[PDB]
Design a protein around this ligand. Structure first.
Ligand SMILES: *[C@@H]1O[C@H](CO)[C@@H](O)[C@H](O)[C@H]1NC(C)=O
Ligand SMILES: *[C@@H]1O[C@H](CO)[C@@H](O)[C@H](O)[C@H]1NC(C)=O
Ligand SMILES: *[C@@H]1O[C@H](CO)[C@@H](O)[C@H](O)[C@H]1NC(C)=O
Lengths: 409, 51, 370
């Protein structure tokens, strides 16, 4: 028949681009294009969702980021609103991992991967450089908590040199100002490779206090995710910092096209199935679930698009991107560069040579054993005698029956 | 030091000096410490130095 | 002179409610609160938003309650986001509202009268007590909240003295179709006389069908479920084996204007304790469109007092989650007919039954001693 899809964007240009994209995919069951702008308030948009859906009887809606930098809520309302009728929605630039959940957002599949897996990749950079000891530094939040969950599952996935074995995690507090306390515990430990993942704004404070803390010289090694490089963070980053980028950072039309293609590849398999009951556009009238909701989602979960403008697009077990590509970028004398490229297990180095903070050109051992350790001890009668000191500060020296000096640490 | 639940949450932590070792206040327990399953779960014990 | 909105959906004794509005004594604190009722049908979210906007913009609303009659939780979630993007507290006092979401915003201010999930686990253990079923096994439906359920259960079992002997926690979901065979297999290993279930009003029918398809019937078993698979006035298919037990609260004798009085009283006493001592009162010129610029007066203090309140001797202290401290609960039983006889009352960590023994449907002997 004729099926209609909708999307919400922030550029008339990409609107015409999506129109052209569906005109082209028409070569591959007619599809009807519908699109709406965004607004500087969740109210009008939360109205527009049915204001246009009911008009169109949509079968899937596409969504991306508005000009708002954070936009932690701009993909919220449009999601669960359609969830009110099990209307599978697709997103592009939704990285903030809230939507990672299956429960709260049973009606959401994304285009890119969320920060969780871009943490997960560090496993391989650890595998190559034979590093073993890592200080994990994350903020206290749901996001950071998910990062912990992912990385811990990853490291635990070693049931078999023991490789890596994390040895501390610091519940850095969000939004704070004074930091150095935690950094002290950081310095005292025995390792150098630290992994920091936090707000794109507070890494500035972190770098400030750390450079003041002098723990940024040689021997130290860093890693970050994505948000930690850009923004004013770059204006405080010491050299040698290693950073990670996605291969398709901000390219709307690319994902738009891949999306309309994959949804065509879906609907062509959809319309040739039995019991296909149209989701009604009567959100005011109707109040039940078109079984072609979770039915639509169950059928989506098997497709494997051949090749897009972003290469092969595959979906995970939870409804998100699978097997993207990453650029292992770097900072070099206040001049960002590229160094490597990751995809899958392939971790390809390249021409330019890596550097490490302090100017060293080796791959430092990441840790040197201490030689001044501490000791605990209880007060037990024949094993550990406890006695107050003499007035001089030490305590009086005695002798056994053999007359020998008695050690009195 | 033993093990126990805390804060009426699903957190089971280690009171006492053994717990101190677990958290990073020192790196050796020289004292009349005993040996048993629970403690031997995650701490490495030297060979026994007094029976 | 605060404004308080009260909405209804469905059938209800509207006049009786408007009358019981003036049921209490608000003499000794300057509030003079206004009231404004509205009825409506069950059309859509947009209706809801439009209406709440009209109310808050019109009568200088500073707090809303809500009731309903269906079995839809999404609407609740919607209202949650409302309280998110809207700095006023909201009280889901009755109906499909009071169904418990998974969580709340770190900033939203929405609450609902009803048991927590931990409250239910606790009370059902207290009922495992009086009648001495000391061995059980549990099964779930992969609704994500289940992890908290089982964890609270185990971390209350491991500590105490009595001989809690649980066995073989099981986890099943055939969300992938035609996995039902696996179900019929994985359920065969339930040797305990007591089974516990966290499921959905939809799946449970099929689940009990398969259960009788294995042998677990009212001969030598007995089941327990939380309210989230029950409806008191509601009815159920025959697949529910007779004699099923579960737990709800005192709807059967509280779901009435007195709840409305309770809500009005609580918002009033909060407004009195917090705003008088602080001498301020957040009174937005309540827009609904163009509210992103209205957060200038961060609430940040109503919460700081909305949890420590009381009146009429009844304590209404609220916990951070969205449940209360302790609401009066009831335990009900499937009878011969499809009816829920009121069996047991519960309040203040205390359980009170109407029996000393469990009526059962022969190798079960009395025995004397000395
Ligand atoms: C942080 O606090 C320490 C003392 O705890 C103080 O010495 C230091 O100057 C403070 N720095 C910042 C950036 O707040
Ligand atoms: C997006 O990517 C496509 C190919 O992948 C390219 O043709 C186009 O110019 C890119 N546009 C932007 C803005 O990056
Ligand atoms: C609650 O309020 C009463 C009376 O105002 C006061 O005595 C009590 O300490 C308060 N408790 C809390 C937790 O605020």
């Amino acid at each position: 028949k004729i099926v209609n899809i909708g999307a919400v964007l922030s550029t008339r240009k990409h609107e015409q681009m999506f129109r052209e994209a569906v005109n082209q995919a028409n070569k591959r069951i007619q599809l009807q294009a519908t699109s709406v702008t965004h607004k500087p308030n969740a109210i009008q948009m939360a109205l527009s969702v049915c204001e246009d859906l009911i008009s169109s009887q949509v079968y899937a809606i596409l969504v991306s980021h508005p000009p708002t930098p954070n936009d932690h809520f701009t993909p919220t309302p449009v999601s669960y609103t359609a969830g009110f009728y099990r209307i599978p929605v697709l997103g592009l630039t939704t990285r903030m991992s809230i939507y990672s959940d299956k429960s709260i957002h049973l009606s959401f599949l994304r285009t890119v991967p969320p920060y969780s897996h871009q943490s997960s990749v560090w496993f391989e950079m650890m595998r190559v450089y034979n590093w073993n000891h890592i200080i994990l530094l994350v903020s206290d939040d749901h996001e950071g908590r998910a990062a912990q969950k992912r990385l811990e599952t990853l490291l635990e996935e070693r049931e078999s040199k023991r490789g890596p074995k994390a040895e501390k995690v610091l519940q850095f507090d969000p939004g704070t100002k004074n930091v150095t306390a935690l950094l002290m515990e950081a310095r005292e430990l025995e390792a150098r490779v630290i992994i920091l993942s936090a707000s794109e704004d507070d890494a500035a404070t972190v770098y400030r206090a750390a450079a003041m803390l002098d723990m940024t010289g040689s021997g130290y090694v860093w890693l970050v995710g994505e948000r930690e490089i850009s923004g004013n963070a770059l204006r405080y980053a010491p050299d040698g910092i290693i950073g990670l980028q996605l291969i398709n950072g901000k390219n709307e039309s690319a994902h738009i096209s891949d999306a309309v293609g994959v949804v065509a590849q879906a609907v062509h398999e959809l319309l040739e199935k039995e019991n296909i009951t149209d989701p009604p556009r009567g959100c005011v009238g109707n109040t039940n679930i078109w079984k072609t909701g979770p039915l639509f989602k169950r059928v989506l979960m098997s497709s494997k698009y051949a090749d897009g403008v972003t290469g092969r697009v595959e979906f995970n077990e939870d409804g998100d991107r699978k097997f993207a590509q990453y650029s292992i970028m770097n900072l070099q004398n206040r001049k960002l560069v590229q160094v490597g490229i990751y995809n899958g297990t392939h971790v390809i180095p390249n021409d330019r040579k890596i550097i490490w903070p302090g100017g060293e050109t080796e791959k430092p051992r990441g840790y040197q054993m201490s030689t001044r350790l501490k000791i605990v001890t209880i007060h037990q009668e024949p094993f550990v005698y406890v006695k107050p000191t003499m007035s001089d500060g030490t305590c009086k020296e005695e002798f056994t029956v053999n007359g020998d000096p008695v050690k009195k640490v | 030091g033993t093990q126990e639940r805390v804060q009426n949450s699903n957190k089971k932590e280690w009171n006492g000096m053994m717990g101190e070792l677990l958290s990073g206040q020192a790196d050796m327990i020289v004292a009349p410490l005993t040996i048993n399953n629970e403690r031997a779960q995650y701490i490495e014990f030297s060979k026994p130095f007094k029976y | 002179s605060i404004g308080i909105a009260v909405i209804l959906v469905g059938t209800s004794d509207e006049v009786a409610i408007k009358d019981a509005h003036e049921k209490d004594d608000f003499h000794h604190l300057s509030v003079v609160p206004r009231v404004e009722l509205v009825a409506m049908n069950e059309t859509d979210p947009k209706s809801i938003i439009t209406r709440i906007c009209d109310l808050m913009s019109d009568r200088k609303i500073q707090g809303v309650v809500f009731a309903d009659d269906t079995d839809q939780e999404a609407i609740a979630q919607i209202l949650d986001f409302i309280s998110a993007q809207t700095l006023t507290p909201i009280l889901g006092i009755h109906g499909g509202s009071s169904m418990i979401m998974a969580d709340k915003d770190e900033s939203s201010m929405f609450f609902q009268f009803g048991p927590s999930i931990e409250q239910q686990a606790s009370v059902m253990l207290n009922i495992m007590e009086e009648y001495d079923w000391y061995i059980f096994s549990i099964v779930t439906t992969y609704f994500p909240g289940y992890q908290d359920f089982v964890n609270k259960i185990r971390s209350t079992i491991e500590n105490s003295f009595v001989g809690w002997e649980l066995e073989e926690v099981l986890l099943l979901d055939m969300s992938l179709d035609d996995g039902d065979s696996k179900i019929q297999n994985q359920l065969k290993k339930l040797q305990s006389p007591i089974i516990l279930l966290y499921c959905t009003k939809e799946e449970a029918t099929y689940i009990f069908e398969v259960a009788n398809s294995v042998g677990l019937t009212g001969y030598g078993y007995t089941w327990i479920v939380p309210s989230l698979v029950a409806g008191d006035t509601d009815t159920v298919p025959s697949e529910f084996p007779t004699g099923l037990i579960s737990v709800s609260y005192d709807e059967w004798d509280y779901g009435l204007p007195a709840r409305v009085r309770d809500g009005i009283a609580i918002i009033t006493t909060a407004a009195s304790d917090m705003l008088s001592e602080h001498s301020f009162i957040p009174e937005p010129k309540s827009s609904c469109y163009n509210t992103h610029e209205k957060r200038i007066y961060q609430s940040n203090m109503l919460n700081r007092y909305l949890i420590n309140v009381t009146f009429e001797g009844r304590d209404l202290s609220f916990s951070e989650d969205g449940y209360q401290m302790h609401p009066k609960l009831v335990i009900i039983l499937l009878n011969k007919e499809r009816k829920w006889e009121r069996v047991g009352k519960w309040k203040d960590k205390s359980l009170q039954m109407k029996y000393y023994v469990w009526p059962r449907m022969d190798d079960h002997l009395s025995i004397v001693t000395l």
